[PDB]
Amino acid sequence: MQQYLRLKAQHPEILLFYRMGDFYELFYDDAKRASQLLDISLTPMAGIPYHAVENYLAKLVNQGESVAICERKVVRIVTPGTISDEALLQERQDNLLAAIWQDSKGFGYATLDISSGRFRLSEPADRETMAAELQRTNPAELLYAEDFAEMSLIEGRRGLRRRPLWEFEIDTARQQLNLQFGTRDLVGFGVENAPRGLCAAGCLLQYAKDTQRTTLPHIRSITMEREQDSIIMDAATRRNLEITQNLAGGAENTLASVLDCTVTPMGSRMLKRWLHMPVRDTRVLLERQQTIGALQDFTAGLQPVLRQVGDLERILARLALRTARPRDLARMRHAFQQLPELRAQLETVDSAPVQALREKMGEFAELRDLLERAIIDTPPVLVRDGGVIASGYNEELDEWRALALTSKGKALALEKQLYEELFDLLLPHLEALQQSASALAELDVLVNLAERAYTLNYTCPTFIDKPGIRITEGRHPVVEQVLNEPFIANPLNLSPQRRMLIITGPNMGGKSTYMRQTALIALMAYIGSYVPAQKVEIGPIDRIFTRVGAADDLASGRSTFMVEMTETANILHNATEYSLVLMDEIGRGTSTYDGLSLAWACAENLANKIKALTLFATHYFELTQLPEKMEGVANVHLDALEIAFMHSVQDGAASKSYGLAVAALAGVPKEVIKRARQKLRELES
Template sequence: MTTYTPMIQQYLQIKAQHEDAFLFFRLGDFYELFFNDAVEAAHILEITLTSRDAGSRDRIPMCGVPYHSAEGYIESLIEKGHKVAICEQTEDPKAAKGIVKREVVKIVTPGTMTEGKTIDANSNHFIGAADSIDSSHYALAYLDLATGEGKVECIEGSERTLISEIEALGMREVVVCENLHITLSDSLAKRGIVLSIEHRKETYEAEELFTEIPATVVDTCELLLSYVKRTQKSALDHIKPFEFVQKQSKLSIDANSMRNLELIQSIRTGGKDGTLYGLLDETVTAMGARKLKMWIHQPLAEKGAIEKRLGTVSALIDDYFLRDELQTNLRDVYDIERLAGRISMGSANGRDLAQLRNSLRSVPTIKTALESSDQPLLSQFAKRIDPCEQALQLLENAIAENPPLSVKEGGVMKDGFDAKLDQYRDASKNGKAWLTELEREERERTGIKSLKIGYNRIFGYFIEITKSNIHLADLERYERKQTLANAERYITPELKEKEDLILNAEAEGLALEYVLFTSVREEMREHIRHLQQLASVLSELDVLLTFAHVSEKRNYVKPSFHEGKALLIKNGRHPVVEKMMDHSLYVPNSCKLKEEANMLLITGPNMSGKSTYMRQVALTVVMAQIGCYVPCDEAMLPITDQIFTRIGAADDLASGQSTFMMEMMESQNAIVNATERSLLLFDEIGRGTSTYDGMALAQAMMEHIHHEIGANTLFSTHYHELTNLDNELPRLENVHVAAMEQDGKVVFLHKVMAGAADKSYGIYVAELAGLPSELLDRAKDLLTTFENAHAVQLPESEPEQMTFFDLQKEEPESVSKEEEAILDQIATMDVLNMTPLKALQTVFELKEKLDSKKG
């Protein structure tokens, strides 16, 4: 049996309790890693792998990182989906008997990391917990450890619906019980989400965290808090009561729709440029940026709440000078939410408290400005602002104006806050000046001009008098300390006291300052709830000011809402596209969905703007329901409960799904979960399969939505045969995006007009893409050939329900069996999904067959 040294045995005992994490084991000024941890970490971090004697026959692998720079290495491991257990020395090595005591003081995980370069201050960093309630419902709780913001929701549907919400919230880590781990592990791992098992559910005495949520989801919140408490090993007083996200009060947008509409993240760049969030984000605080992002993710679905936000935005638009004053003062407000979190977890430094103090200094001005408004909504807003005067007073008294980053450097506490600290500082800074002054005073008192004050390491400070002047010394005050050949050295009680102060001033001062700072930080914990409430109100104000600023700058209008389903957007504009181009060149388009006709079938050429038009309608709905003005001349809208989109084509490589499978899965999600209050956007359904399959699926979906769901729907298609469905579906109307042929060229008008389009102009789009002219000419010939070879006509007597099984074929007049076989092959070709090059290749193959038969 292998015998290791006591230190390695200690390491192995601690490692056995944290097998799923890299163990950073503190040895002096380094964190060391051993065995497999060392091998893996050295590879990931690109650091030297070495070895050491561990008492066994063979040396063991080892690598290490300096203590002072460990944060960067830890962050690298977390970014790659790993966990890191920080093991510290918990006693002074000098006082230790035997092996120094060590224990894990914190486990850093992808979901609990609160600091670092990869943590975006303008985004929430949620860790989640999921559990099944019954066979068709899941509870999903999520917490931003940095801000203390916790929410929980009940998700109805399949695991795919649950995973979609986890993705939409941007979670890096999800905590589950063991039974759910089996079913979710593969799906989440493919998406780069860490799945952690928590075996214990602690029952929390802090019942105030669960007062606003149903009993069915409390266990999931406790599961999450149990994991966070176990890994962080610190106070979590800043965690707010969990908010229950009620489905009926929010506009639900799944992850695919969030992505397709580019609400938060650009499909092309992955950043915020080109998104609705990027367009609207003119907030001046990090708290406001996070709140804006959350509002976009979870728009309102209650008419009264929406109109209250819109009313506040209107009041701010009407008072430019107030708006400017408020934004100017908000610029001086730091991230109060995260500062409160650092205070609670004991990680706040002097600069954090100074930032909090500076933020609180701006609050009274903001409150007074709102109170002075003659707009009731703004004066009421002022009543919600608590200036936190006691917290501000404590910080004003205690914290220096410009403290250093590290408490250990000193200079954090304000002069005058503590008399003893002032003495230490005075002794440290003015010690030499004091000694010079004491030397002058003693010379005057004794009349000995040669008297001097000196210092050595053995005796410390002393008064030195030559033997010829000893008779002048005040021997009642002087105590002999050392005798020299020509002089005597003395000390006085006053000099002894000052010696202790001077020699120990810096060390003692720093130690006292740290105690005083931690005491102030601890006292600030009493104000955390008030600070969080203040942060919530100020962040809301920041977002509403942003809405007012952007709406006025971009000539948006205030939308109105009604209880019906009709939707009217007059001369609407896609807000992001409009921003990227000259406003005067943008072609606005109206959208009118009636109570009796709330489905639009959109046809038109490629690149004409069908997808942009559909997205524009959805973005208008989202903007209105977050409480912002909208880009159009007039908007009368229903309250929408869900938005589902099937726009764009991209394989989901992470989950191994093809484009067509993704299209069908997204369509299924909409068909199963949509209600009559939802908004559905379907773009080119059926492209990834054969023509007849695609048309059949598209028609069946339209019929199902029309008959069974009744939702407001925009459905674009290249299947022009579907435009006849308006005869069968009373609530369906045709519109098209217009194009005009001029001088042999096609001009896209980007204007949506009533009726169906007559052409798709696909070959012209290929010409714009720069394909060779000879290829394009051949494609035009092929198109004529295909159209003549297999024209599709509707039956003369229309059946009660239109079906593609009744489509008639024109019979060729007189052809051979070989020619008939070639015509049948042409008839079954998926022309609309055939590239020009493939079409050209096909024609050559068919021509060779015909030539070979003739030969």
């Protein structure tokens, strides 16, 4: 098997499936590794059946192992982060391939999603910023330089690939990006000025082309992300707020669950991206609020029609690579048929953004006519053994079928030839189809947000020039849905005159909920959707900081005081007058004298020098003295009556938080409580 060895030499570290007869067979060391990973029988030869190759590949991709498929040439390389096929891919989640580079100046980062074609680059300078980017992106595959100095960040990620220095060279990168984009200058894209990002991008493009083994028609643009453009949240802040996953790792009880009712899969993925990155620019937000208001009345008619369209973004990418299935094309014909009705309903409503969206969608009538002649309504799964081309598209194919094994073979050859030509006719308009899919996806997200607003009484928010937040009748999006009992509503007022509020309250009195609600409303205003309150006035916000969830991590090697203290440090170092900080009790883990001393100091610094908008929850009642000392801090108290909880914020400072009464509600035995009351009376005495 010298031929296997020579091909293996080309790809030494990647498992190779060699197609012999009807099976793909690994050999030698690869067979041993495969038998352990896929539980196959190690006869050294290990075999995978041709029909179920996708199922096995899915297991290897989850593991992170690259596979090379050989039909002799290697047609393609399948890797985590570079997969276009439906079975490996996830309906409501996306795969990102990333490259990281380190220079003396700083870090360079690039991310490409193969199916959407979205290419983004950035240059994080601090070590901390790179970590936050790595977490939000969650790249499936990371390509890194051999000399990377800090390998602490890269080791956790799955599918790491080590890269040689020559690939990251800047001069080759500028030339390569220019050829694919087709622009002599990257100045129009805006990526020409920053060298480190371009180096990472050149490597990513080179690797992607190598794995795909074909031209990439879909990628036509590159973009740069900057800190001024979006609100910044550290990974700890993101997890505590539970935007897409709860603290225990589950889908339910999340802001996404309340707001995601989208009919199409592409809408769902897009909503999550919008939720993760709040957009600071007021102009895009104003257009979004207006489109939502216009379509609120017509939402019911549009939701059934949109569902039929389905996800087209993925289908277009498969068409670009010429791997599209017969079923994929048929789903597209159905989507085109839905486009005329959508346009008619959209024409009646009159608003400038909505009309533009209607124009972007298009009708593509000529293409639909071609598909209706070209494809049968029920399509056989395999083109290789299928009657996918319908009768009447081609006179010759019909003649061969009527003549009907030479006739069958000729017909089969003709059918495949016609199928390939079909890709060619559809290719000239591929940019137009790609533009439409983006427009339809935006519509689904916007219609869904409108329906939710009507059902749950949401209200549009108003932006202001100075940074401040004012709310009337505020209701938490998640807790209100969960509690059967009526959710009491709490107002909020924050201004440069009153930046900080110290919330002191009885246990189980609603203090944590009030703080989580304020942050969640601000994230919603900046995604441009409606806010659950009677009136919202919101200023500019650069960053959101949350210190609400307490845990100690063994993998981190950190105790609970340590995890809490690390988070306080990030806030003190990176806070800005624009950012909003909400924090829970400080020094809970350690002894009382130390905890009070540390908390008084952190609060004084945040009010006096950082000047950020802040909400502070304290069980230490000495801290209520601090608002008197410093301007810009005020006291607000949640209230409860004995025990029954009012759940309503009032001005003033709470005293005598009750723990023993809460313990009785918990079920602690009465005799234990009786001794405790006696002990407490002694301690106070």
